[PDB]
């Protein structure tokens, strides 16, 4: 595979998101790290699919709602940022106020 440090680093984010994903499935209100991980992983997969940065900037705001996370969590996350390999190379996706 010849994994570079960055590819290995992203595997950490993916795994963190697996934890959050299973807890959300149980019906738990997600905490700070779980929320960031879940939304971030979503975006990376969107990039793998070939979606545009513009589309993901919007879609990322509809992954989790205020009723699916602990109190104060939405305020602790003014935005989420993550980079992934789009068909046209690495791009930064910034999602402002992802949880409403």
């Amino acid at each position: 595979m010849e994994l570079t440090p960055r590819e290995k680093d992203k595997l950490l984010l993916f795994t963190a998101a697996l934890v959050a994903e299973r807890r959300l499935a149980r019906g738990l209100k997600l905490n700070y790290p779980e929320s960031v991980a879940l939304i971030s992983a979503f975006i990376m997969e969107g990039a793998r699919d070939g979606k545009s940065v513009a589309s993901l900037m919007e879609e990322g705001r509809h992954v989790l709602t205020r009723e699916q996370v602990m109190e104060g969590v939405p305020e602790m996350i003014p935005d989420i940022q993550v980079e992934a390999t789009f068909p046209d190379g690495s791009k930064l996706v910034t999602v402002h106020n992802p949880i409403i």
Binding site: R6, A16, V36, A37, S40, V73, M76, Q81, V82
Partner: protein, 553 residues
């Protein structure tokens, strides 16, 4: 020109009269003072203040600080004030108003071409923590503690060996030497404790001469009156501190016999409540004496629903004599009253190395909730309680071990070990950890990203933790004897060396905001703790702040 206080707070952080909530607790701090000149605040950025001829002067390196933390909200034992912090030569240069004297008024911290900038507006800055109950079971503990905001670690050990698992002792010259050498590799300041259990003073003097800054008396090695006396005699001679874990079995005598053996001499009692070790069931009565500097280990802080249940197995007839709901509940209140002066971990030996700071604030939260405001509190804020508690893991531990001349607080002349916190994560996950003027660790995003913020963001070591830079930014504490015998040169230690002093003259009255000597008693049968006849107790928490909202596991 005018600006609303809200827009101001968003731009330069809070000012006088503004309150800030500490993380998700019920503790609120109010800015007591602001050392700026409204309109002359320094801000870094495109088109901002810190630029040539403007907020940045023409002075040479010798005439300006190497680092300035702009618009910091300082929280220390002496106050909660807004100001700029200047760091020069790895030490705290001044707390005041930074800028360029050529065009700005009241500049006390000159910024020049040689000045680096750390934007602290909207952030809380504190002194690095000091943990004095470290079991050197593994080197990984250093990074864990550093990440939590602890910059100095005092303790003993040689690795995952039976002796170290149980006691904070680095036995003898050979191991002491080896550990002093290994210390150069760790990103925190370090001081070692030797084995103080022996009735031959020369066996102790050797260890001090080898490098230890203290001696640990532990019951596993025999905390007998003869051993205790011998260790204190050598301590008084060599100006080093003694840490005690008394005779839980009451084999050689009761608590009063141990106190008698100590004979009014200065001593640091570890986990004074008893769960972590000590005369059953009244070692807690030690906090009434003037020569005792009492500390708590962290598993019992604060009293919660699961506390008792987990403790039996972490310990596993004298189990139920050691684990007592009565003394565990009282301990929290004694901290709130200032009867207990320090907090520590007891790393991997009935203690959590990365939870010293976090647990200290949870106790403060639970005490405010249960007991209301302190009698010393002024105004509608928890400023005094905050000062009382922060002192427990910063200045007090430093005073107890004779290193307050180097670290322990944000004061001029002291080593620049600082922790920057976002108010929402205060005491839980720091934004930046500075060791000797250099950032040693901080949360860092994707290395290949266009900016440092994209996920995944996790703590990664910075330049202050690398090779020679690290050696220059950390201190290895030695006993006056070791320093004199030239141990640093002999072992070829590469880090900065600091010497301990003032260990024998410190007393309970010297503990900042925590000098209470209560008329405390413990019922031999029921284990109830009473101060002046009044029952001291508290209720166990079902939920705590600084917990499930921040951690992934």
């Amino acid at each position: 020109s005018n600006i609303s206080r809200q827009a101001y707070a968003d731009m330069f952080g809070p000012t006088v009269g503004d309150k800030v909530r500490l993380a998700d607790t019920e503790l609120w701090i109010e800015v007591e003072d602001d050392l700026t000149t409204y309109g002359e605040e320094v801000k870094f950025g495109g088109g901002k203040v810190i630029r040539d001829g403007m907020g940045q002067g023409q002075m040479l390196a010798a005439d300006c600080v190497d680092l300035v933390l702009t618009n910091a909200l300082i929280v220390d034992h002496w106050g909660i004030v807004k100001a700029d912090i200047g760091v020069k030569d790895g030490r705290i240069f001044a707390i005041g108003k930074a800028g360029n004297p050529d065009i700005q008024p009241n500049v006390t911290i000159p910024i020049g071409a040689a000045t680096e900038v750390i934007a602290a507006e909207g952030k809380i800055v504190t002194a690095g923590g000091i943990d004095t109950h470290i079991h050197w079971i593994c080197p990984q503990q250093a990074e864990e503690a550093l990440v939590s905001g602890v910059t100095t670690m005092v303790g003993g050990g040689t690795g995952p060996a039976a002796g170290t698992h149980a006691t904070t002792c680095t036995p003898g010259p050979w191991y002491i030497s080896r550990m002093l050498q290994a210390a150069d590799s760790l990103p925190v300041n370090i001081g070692l404790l030797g084995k103080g259990n022996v009735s031959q003073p020369d066996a102790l003097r050797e260890q001090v001469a080898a490098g230890v800054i203290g001696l640990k008396i532990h019951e596993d090695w025999g905390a007998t009156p003869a051993a205790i006396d011998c260790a204190l005699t050598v301590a008084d001679e060599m100006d080093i501190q003694v840490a005690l874990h008394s005779d839980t079995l009451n084999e050689s005598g009761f608590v009063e016999d141990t106190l008698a053996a100590i004979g009014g001499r200065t001593i640091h009692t570890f986990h004074t409540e008893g769960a972590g070790g000590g005369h059953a069931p009244d070692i807690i009565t030690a906090c009434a004496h003037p020569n005792i500097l009492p500390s708590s280990t962290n598993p019992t802080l604060p009293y919660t629903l699961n506390t008792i249940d987990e403790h039996l197995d972490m310990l596993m007839a004298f189990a139920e004599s050691r684990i007592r709901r009565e003394t565990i509940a009282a301990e929290d209140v004694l901290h709130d009253l200032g009867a207990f002066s320090l907090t520590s971990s007891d790393s991997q030996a009935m203690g959590r190395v990365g939870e010293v700071i976090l647990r200290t604030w949870q106790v403060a939260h639970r005490m405010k909730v249960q007991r209301g405001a302190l009698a010393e509190e002024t105004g509608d804020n928890d400023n005094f309680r905050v000062k009382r508690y922060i002192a427990k893991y910063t200045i007090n531990p430093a005073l107890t071990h004779g290193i307050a001349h180097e670290v322990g607080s944000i004061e001029v002349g002291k080593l620049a070990d600082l922790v920057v916190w976002s108010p929402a994560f205060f005491g839980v996950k720091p934004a930046t950890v500075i060791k000797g003027g250099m950032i040693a660790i901080a949360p860092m995003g994707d290395i290949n990203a266009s900016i440092p913020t994209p996920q995944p963001v996790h703590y990664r070591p910075m330049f202050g933790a690398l090779g020679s830079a690290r050696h220059h930014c950390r201190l290895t504490f030695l006993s006056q004897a070791a320093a004199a015998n030239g141990v640093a040169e002999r072992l070829n230690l590469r880090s900065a060396i600091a010497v301990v002093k003032g260990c024998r003259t410190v007393q309970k009255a010297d503990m900042v905001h925590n000098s209470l000597q209560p008329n405390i008693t413990v019922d031999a049968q029921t284990y109830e703790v009473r101060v002046d006849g009044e029952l001291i107790t508290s209720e166990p928490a079902d939920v705590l702040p600084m917990a499930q909202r921040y951690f992934l596991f």
